[PDB]
Amino acid sequence: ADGRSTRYWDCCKPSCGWAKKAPVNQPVFSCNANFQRITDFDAKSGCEPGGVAYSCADQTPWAVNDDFALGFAATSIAGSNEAGWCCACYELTFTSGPVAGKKMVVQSTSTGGDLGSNHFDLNIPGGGVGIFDGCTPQFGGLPGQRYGGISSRNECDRFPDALKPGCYWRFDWFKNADNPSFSFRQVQCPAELVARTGCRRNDDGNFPAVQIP
Numbered sequence: 108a109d110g111r112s113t114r115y116w117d118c119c120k121p122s123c124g125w126a127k128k129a130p131v132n133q134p135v136f137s138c139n140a141n142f143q144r145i146t147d148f149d150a151k152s153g154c155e156p157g158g159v160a161y162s163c164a165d166q167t168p169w170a171v172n173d174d175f176a177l178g179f180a181a182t183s184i185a186g187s188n189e190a191g192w193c194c195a196c197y198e199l200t201f202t203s204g205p206v207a208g209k210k211m212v213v214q215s216t217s218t219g220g221d222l223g224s225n226h227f228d229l230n231i232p233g234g235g236v237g238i239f240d241g242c243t244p245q246f247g248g249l250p251g252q253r254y255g256g257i258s259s260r261n262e263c264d265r266f267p268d269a270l271k272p273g274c275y276w277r278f279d280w281f282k283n284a285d286n287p288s289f290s291f292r293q294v295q296c297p298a299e300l301v302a303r304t305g306c307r308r309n310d311d312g313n314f315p316a317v318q319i320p
């Protein structure tokens with residue numbers, strides 16, 4: 108199937124970070140203000156007044172080589188629901204922009220709201236906070252516009268150290284692609300991705316595996 112991508116980073120607790128959202132071993136980890144994992148899955152989101160749980164900095168993208176990357180996304184997939192996509196992994200092959208032909212395997216860690224579409228909101232620090240700014244309360248805020256975030260690579264240098272690597276990836280591996288389209292299929296999650304969220308679905312074994320170069 109084909110879909111559409113956007114980019115974001117709002118610092119909020121991800122929607123698959125609550126129990127009973129899907130058939131998983133444990134929900135996606137959330138983190139405290141200094142990015143340390145928290146073990147109470149019921150902690151209040153940092154995007155709500157008085158909340159303490161934020162997005163973890165290790166749930167950011169990285170390049171394995173020039174044609175293949177790994178990362179995370181907030182998703183809305185036509186024909187399915189949050190119990191079907193939370194913690195599932197998908198292989199994307201970009202079909203437009205400067206990254207056309209490149210592949211990226213992502214794990215869904217949150218939910219978007221685009222009915223009838225296959226929307227993947229890629230986790231990218233500096234990609235834009237959108238409606239909720241959890242980053243201001245967390246550490247003082249991130250630069251950039253609300254929708255779309257920063258403009259140039261040099262802006263990543265003023266970010267907190269734990270979010271710099273994901274910020275640079277947008278300009279380096281991703282070539283600053285602006286909402287590229289893609290074709291995708293559901294795949295078994297790589298161990299590398301499950302290591303950062305802690306969340307593996309019970310039906311993961313019913314899908315094909317991908318070979319990380």
Ligand SMILES: OC[C@H]1O[C@@H](O[C@H]2[C@H](O)[C@@H](O)[C@H](O)O[C@@H]2CO)[C@H](O)[C@@H](O)[C@@H]1O
Binds near residue numbers: 235
């Ligand atoms: O609402 C989805 C997502 O949008 C992100 O901004 C988009 C914006 O909606 C689109 O008009 C513009 O062309 O591209 C940007 C970047 O993809 C926003 O950054 C996210 O917080 C939000 O979740």
